[PDB]
C-alpha cells in the first residue's frame, strides 16, 4: 500500500548539493592553498582533530558562481534548516577526498590513530585478496571492482572517521554585505516550531555537568566468527546485542557468543548545560525560564558557569513527555546540540597575539597617559573622584602571585572597601566593574548569603553523583566579587569573607562537605557608617563599625564621603544633567575607551611579572618605618586610625607591581612606589575636608 508512506517532493535536491560541496571544499581560494585541503592535510598530518565550517565562505563562493552566471542552488537557506542531514553527509565528501598521511605513523601519537589505521589497512587487504581470488576463478575494473565491494563487508567510513565536524553561522555583517540566518534569540522567543533549524541563543550558562564519555557505537567481539559486530547507539539507552548477528553464524547451527570491547567502542565527549534567559530580555512580570543544551566532542569545555555566551547550534526534539498520564500524545522534549561558541566577556587565559589585537593595544598606548586615560575611562558616567577609579584598574591587574618554591603562597591580589555616605554612588561603580570584569559577580547583604557564599551540595540532575555547587566566591574565581550593603551582612558571612581576603581558600567541615576550596577572588566592598553619614565627633574606629582585624585585610579603604560646597557641586550638576539630556559623555578633548579593548589591554598586562630594584627596595623600607613610627607613636589620638602593618607594606609592593604592569614594564621603579603611597594616604585626606 504505497498510499501508506505517501510520496511527496520538495524543491531540495541533495543528490546535487553534494556535487556542490565536492567543489567548495577544493574550489575556494578567497582565503597551503585551497585552504580546506591544506586543513585536511593537517588532519593527514594528524595535528588537529576538529573541522570548523563557516557560512562566510559559502556565500562568497556562490558569488563567484552567480556573477559568472553559474547556478548557486543555495546551500545556506537549506543548511539553516535540517542541519543533522548535512552534518552527516557534508562529512562524507571529506572522507572521499582528503590528502594522504605524511608524518608516518609513530609511537608518540594518540592511541586512537593506530586503531583506525589498522582497520583502514585491513579494509584494503580484503579487497586485494577477494579480487585476486575472483580473477583466479576461471574468469574490467568497473565491472570487477563493484563485485568485490558488494561481496565484501567492511568497516564503515563513519567508524573510520578521524575527526569531529562542526558549523558556525555567518554574522550579520555578511548578511547585510551582499544583503536572517542568526538572530540571537531569547529562550522565550524560540516559539517551538524552529525545531530542526540552526539557531543562535544567548543567556547565562547557570549550570553544567562534568564531561564524561557517552557511547555512539558499541563494538562487539565474536571469537567463533572473528567478525566484529558494531551496534549504533542513538537514544539514551541500549540493550546488549548478545545474540551474535554475524554473517558467518547466521547460516550456521551454533550462534556463538560475543563480548563488548570498551576501546573499539566509538565514544564522544558529552557535556550539557542550562542557559537561563538573559534577564533584561524577559518581559514585564515574567520569569527567566531555562533551556537544555547538549554538547559533543572537541567543543566540550568551552562552556563554564556564570558566563554569558552566544551559542550557535541545531535545535532538536528528544523523546520525553512527562509520566504517561500527564500526556496528550507524541509530545517531545527539546534540546540544542551545540556547534560553535563565542562569549561576550572573554577568558583571560587565551590572549595570544595576532594581526588584529596588537594594533588594538598599540593604538591605545600611543596617545600616552594610559593609566589616567583608563581610570577616567572606567565608569565615566559618574563624576570625578579619579583616585578611586584609578585604584579599580589596579584591582583588575592585581599585581603578582608569589610562590616561595618552598611550600608558601602569598596573595597576588587586591582587596578594597568603598566606605562612605549616601549620594556618592557606590553600586554603580560596583556594577560597572562587574561588567568590565570577566567572571565578575555582584552580591548583597542578606538572605541566601550563607550558602550563597559557600559550597552547597547537590544531587546532579543528569547523572548519579553529588556535586558541590559554588556560591559567589566560587562562582567567581580569578576575578572580582562585589559586595554591597556590606555591614548588613552577619558573622556567618564575615567569617567566610575574612578568610578569603587573607588567603585564596575556604574550608568547610559540616555534613557531607569536608573539602578545602580554592577562592582566588578579589573582594571589592561598599559599606556605610553606623549613621549612614559620618559623624565628625567620632573617631574612625568608632565611626566605622567593622573590626580592625578584618579592616587590615583591606589593602585600601576609601573614606569616600561628601561635604556640600558652592563650586564643586555645580560641575557635578552639569555632568548629570548633560548625561541625562542624552546618553553621551562630556565634550572633553578625550574619548572614554571602549571596554572590550581595555579588557584586551588588561589581559596583556596580566602577563607581566615585574621585579623590584634595590633602589626602591631600600626606599620602601624607610618609608614604611616612618609610616609605622608615625602611625604608632603619634597617631593614636583623635582622627587617628589603625596601625601600620607588614600587610600594608605588601600592599604597597602589590600596588607598585600593578603600576609597573600597567606600564608594561619588566621592572619596578622608584617612580612607582611614590605613587602607590599617595593612593594609600589620599584615601583618608578626604576626612579633613
Amino acid at each position: 500500500m504505497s498510499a501508506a508512506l505517501p510520496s511527496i517532493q520538495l524543491p531540495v535536491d541533495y543528490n546535487n548539493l553534494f556535487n556542490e560541496i565536492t567543489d567548495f571544499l577544493v574550489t575556494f581560494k578567497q582565503d597551503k592553498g585551497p585552504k580546506y585541503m591544506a586543513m585536511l592535510q593537517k588532519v593527514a598530518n594528524r595535528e588537529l582533530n576538529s573541522v570548523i565550517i563557516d557560512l562566510d565562505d559559502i556565500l562568497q563562493y556562490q558569488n563567484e558562481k552567480f556573477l559568472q552566471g553559474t547556478q548557486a542552488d543555495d546551500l545556506v537557506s537549506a543548511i539553516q534548516q535540517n542541519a543533522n542531514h548535512f552534518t552527516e553527509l557534508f562529512c562524507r565528501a571529506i572522507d572521499n577526498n582528503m590528502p594522504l598521511p605524511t608524518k608516518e605513523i609513530d609511537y608518540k601519537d594518540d592511541v586512537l590513530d593506530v586503531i583506525l589505521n589498522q582497520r583502514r589497512l585491513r579494509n584494503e587487504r580484503m579487497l586485494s585478496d577477494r579480487t585476486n581470488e575472483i580473477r583466479s576463478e576461471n574468469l574490467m575494473n568497473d565491472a570487477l571492482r563493484e563485485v568485490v565491494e558488494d561481496e565484501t563487508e567492511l568497516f564503515p567510513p563513519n567508524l573510520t572517521r578521524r575527526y569531529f565536524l562542526y558549523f558556525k553561522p555567518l554574522s550579520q555583517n555578511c548578511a547585510r554585505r551582499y544583503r536572517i540566518s542568526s538572530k540571537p534569540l531569547s529562550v522565550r522567543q524560540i516559539k517551538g516550531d524552529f525545531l530542526g533549524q540552526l539557531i543562535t541563543v544567548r543567556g547565562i550558562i547557570t549550570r553544567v555537568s562534568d564531561v564524561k564519555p557517552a557511547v555512539e557505537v558499541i563494538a562487539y567481539t565474536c571469537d567463533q566468527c572473528g567478525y566484529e559486530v558494531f551496534q549504533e547507539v542513538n537514544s539514551r539507552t541500549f540493550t546488549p546485542l548478545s545474540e551474535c548477528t554475524s554473517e558467518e553464524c547466521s547460516q550456521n547451527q551454533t550462534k556463538g557468543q560475543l563480548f563488548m570491547s570498551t576501546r573499539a567502542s566509538k565514544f564522544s565527549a558529552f557535556q550539557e548545560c542550562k542557559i537561563q534567559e538573559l534577564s533584561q530580555q524577559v518581559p514585564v512580570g515574567h520569569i527567566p525560564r531555562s533551556l537544555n543544551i547538549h554538547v559533543n566532542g572537541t567543543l566540550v569545555r568551552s562552556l563554564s558557569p556564570g558566563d554569558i555566551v552566544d551559542v550557535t547550534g541545531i535545535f532538536l526534539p528528544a523523546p520525553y513527555t512527562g509520566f504517561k498520564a500527564l500526556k496528550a500524545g507524541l509530545l517531545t522534549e527539546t534540546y540544542l546540540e551545540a556547534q560553535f561558541v563565542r562569549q561576550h566577556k572573554k577568558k583571560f587565559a587565551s590572549f595570544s597575539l595576532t594581526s588584529d589585537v596588537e594594533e588594538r593595544v598599540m593604538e591605545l598606548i600611543t596617545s600616552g597617559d594610559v593609566y589616567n586615560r583608563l581610570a577616567k575611562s572606567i565608569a565615566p558616567e559618574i563624576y570625578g573622584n579619579l583616585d578611586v577609579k584609578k585604584a579599580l584598574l589596579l584591582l583588575l591587574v592585581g599585581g603578582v602571585d608569589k610562590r616561595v618554591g618552598d611550600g608558601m603562597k602569598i596573595r597576588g591580589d587586591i582587596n578594597v572597601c568603598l566606605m562612605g555616605d549616601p549620594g556618592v554612588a557606590k553600586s554603580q561603580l560596583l556594577k560597572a566593574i562587574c561588567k568590565i570584569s570577566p567572571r565578575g559577580v555582584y552580591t548583597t547583604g542578606k538572605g541566601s548569603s550563607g550558602v550563597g557564599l559557600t559550597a552547597a551540595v547537590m544531587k546532579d540532575p543528569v547523572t548519579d553523583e553529588m556535586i558541590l555547587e559554588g556560591g559567589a566566591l566560587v562562582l567567581a574565581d580569578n576575578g572580582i566579587c562585589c559586595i554591597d550593603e556590606f555591614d548588613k551582612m552577619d558573622e556567618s558571612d564575615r567569617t567566610a569573607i575574612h578568610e578569603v581576603m587573607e588567603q585564596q581558600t575556604i574550608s568547610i567541615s559540616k555534613a557531607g562537605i569536608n573539602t578545602t576550596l580554592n577562592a582566588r577572588t578579589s573582594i571589592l566592598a561598599a559599606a556605610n557608617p553606623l549613621y549612614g553619614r559620618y559623624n565628625p565627633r567620632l573617631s574612625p574606629l568608632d565611626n566605622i563599625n567593622l573590626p580592625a582585624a578584618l579592616l587590615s585585610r583591606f589593602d585600601i579603604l576609601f573614606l569616600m564621603l561628601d561635604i556640600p560646597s558652592r563650586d564643586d557641586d555645580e560641575k557635578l550638576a552639569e555632568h548629570v544633567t548633560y548625561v541625562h539630556m542624552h546618553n553621551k559623555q562630556p565634550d572633553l578633548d578625550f574619548t572614554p575607551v571602549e571596554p572590550s579593548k581595555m579588557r584586551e589591554y588588561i589581559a596583556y598586562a596580566k602577563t607581566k611579572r615585574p621585579v623590584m630594584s634595590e633602589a626602591v627596595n631600600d626606599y620602601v623600607v624607610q618609608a614604611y618605618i616612618r609610616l609605622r613610627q608615625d602611625s604608632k607613636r603619634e597617631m593614636d589620638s583623635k582622627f587617628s586610625f589603625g596601625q601600620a602593618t607588614p600587610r600594608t607594606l605588601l600592599g604597597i609592593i602589590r600596588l607598585s607591581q600593578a603600576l609597573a604592569k600597567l606600564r608594561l614594564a619588566d621592572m619596578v621603579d622608584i617612580d612607582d612606589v611614590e605613587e602607590a603611597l599617595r593612593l594609600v594616604r589620599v584615601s583618608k585626606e578626604s576626612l579633613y575636608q
Partner: protein, 283 residues
C-alpha cells in the same frame, strides 16, 4: 613480524627489548635526564627480592624514558598497559630464571616454576585529575594525587565458579572469562544427559578480594571554575587495606569506563558511561 590487533606491540620484540634494558641499566637518567658510583641498578633489586618472597616489582617508569633503547616502550605501557604488563609478567619470570641457570643454586626452582611475578608502574607524568581525562584517555595509565574520604567493605568477586549436579555424582568447575560464567546446560553429557538440571553452589567457588575507595582529588593546578571531585576507584587483592581515610596519596592505575544498569528489573544500560580508576600502584 607479529602484531596485536588494534595495537603497535610485538611480543618478542618487546620481550628482548625489556631484557636488554633489564640486564643493562645504571642510573643513566642522572647522566642524561637533566642537569643532575652505582652499577647493575635493577639486578641488585631482583636478587634482593627472591630471598624475601616479596613478589612485587615496583618500577620507576622514568628509568625507561631516559634510557637509550626503551623510549620505544614508555609510550606503549602508558597506552596499552593491560597488554604490556601482561608481557612483563612473563619476561620477568624468564629473567628470574636466567639468574638461576647462571648460578649454582639451591632449589629456588621448585616454586618459581609455578609462582607469579607482577609489575607496579607508578612514576608517571602529571595530569589535571578527572577533568583532563577526555575519552581518548580511556584505558591508559594515569596517576592521581589526593586523599581518601571513605572505603567500602571487601567485596567477593568470582574467579572460579563451581557447578553441582542434582544427579549422577559429577560436579563441574569453569574459570571466568572476561566477566561471564558460561554455565553448561548439558549435564556433561558423556556421564549422562539431563537437559537443564544442574546447580551452582556459592560456597564451593573461589573468590578474589575486591575493595572500593572514594578519593578526594586535588590537582597541582585546577582551572578557575572548578570544585572538588569525589572520584570512586577500585583496588584488588594485595592492595586491600593498603590505604584508608585521611591518607594523602599518589595513586596510579588505569582509567576506565563502565555502564550502569538503569534498574534492578531489566538489562537496559545507561549510555552515559560511568568512570573510575583500576588501581595498579599506590605510593
Amino acid at each position: 613480524l607479529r602484531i596485536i590487533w588494534g595495537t603497535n606491540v610485538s611480543i618478542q620484540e618487546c620481550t628482548t627489548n625489556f631484557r636488554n634494558f633489564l640486564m643493562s641499566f645504571k642510573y643513566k637518567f642522572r647522566k642524561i635526564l637533566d642537569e643532575r658510583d652505582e652499577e647493575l641498578y635493577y639486578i641488585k633489586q631482583l636478587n634482593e627480592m627472591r630471598e624475601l618472597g616479596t613478589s612485587n616489582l615496583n618500577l620507576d617508569a622514568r628509568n625507561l624514558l631516559a634510557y637509550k633503547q626503551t623510549e620505544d616502550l614508555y609510550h606503549q605501557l602508558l597506552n596499552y598497559p593491560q597488554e604490556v604488563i601482561s608481557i612483563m609478567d612473563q619476561t620477568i619470570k624468564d629473567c628470574m630464571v636466567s639468574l638461576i641457570v647462571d648460578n649454582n643454586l639451591d632449589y629456588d626452582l621448585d616454586e618459581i616454576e609455578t609462582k607469579f611475578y607482577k609489575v607496579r608502574p607508578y612514576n608517571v607524568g602529571s595530569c589535571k585529575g578527572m577533568r583532563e581525562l577526555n575519552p581518548n584517555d580511556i584505558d591508559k595509565l594515569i596517576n592521581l594525587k589526593g586523599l581518601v574520604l571513605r572505603s567500602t567493605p571487601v567485596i567477593p568477586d568470582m574467579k572460579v565458579a563451581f557447578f553441582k549436579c542434582n544427579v549422577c555424582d559429577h560436579t563441574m568447575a569453569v574459570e571466568i572469562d572476561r566477566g561471564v560464567i558460561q554455565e553448561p546446560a548439558r549435564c556433561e553429557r558423556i556421564d549422562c544427559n539431563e537437559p537443564n538440571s544442574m546447580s551452582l553452589i556459592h560456597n564451593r567457588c573461589s573468590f578474589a578480594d575486591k575493595q572500593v575507595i572514594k578519593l578526594q582529588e586535588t590537582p597541582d593546578f585546577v582551572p578557575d571554575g572548578q570544585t572538588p571531585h569525589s572520584i570512586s576507584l577500585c583496588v584488588y587483592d594485595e592492595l586491600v587495606d593498603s590505604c584508608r581515610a585521611g591518607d594523602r596519596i599518589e595513586v596510579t592505575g588505569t582509567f576506565r569506563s563502565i555502564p550502569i544498569r538503569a534498574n534492578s528489573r531489566q538489562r537496559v544500560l545507561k549510555s552515559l558511561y560511568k568512570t573510575y580508576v583500576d588501581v595498579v600502584h599506590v605510593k
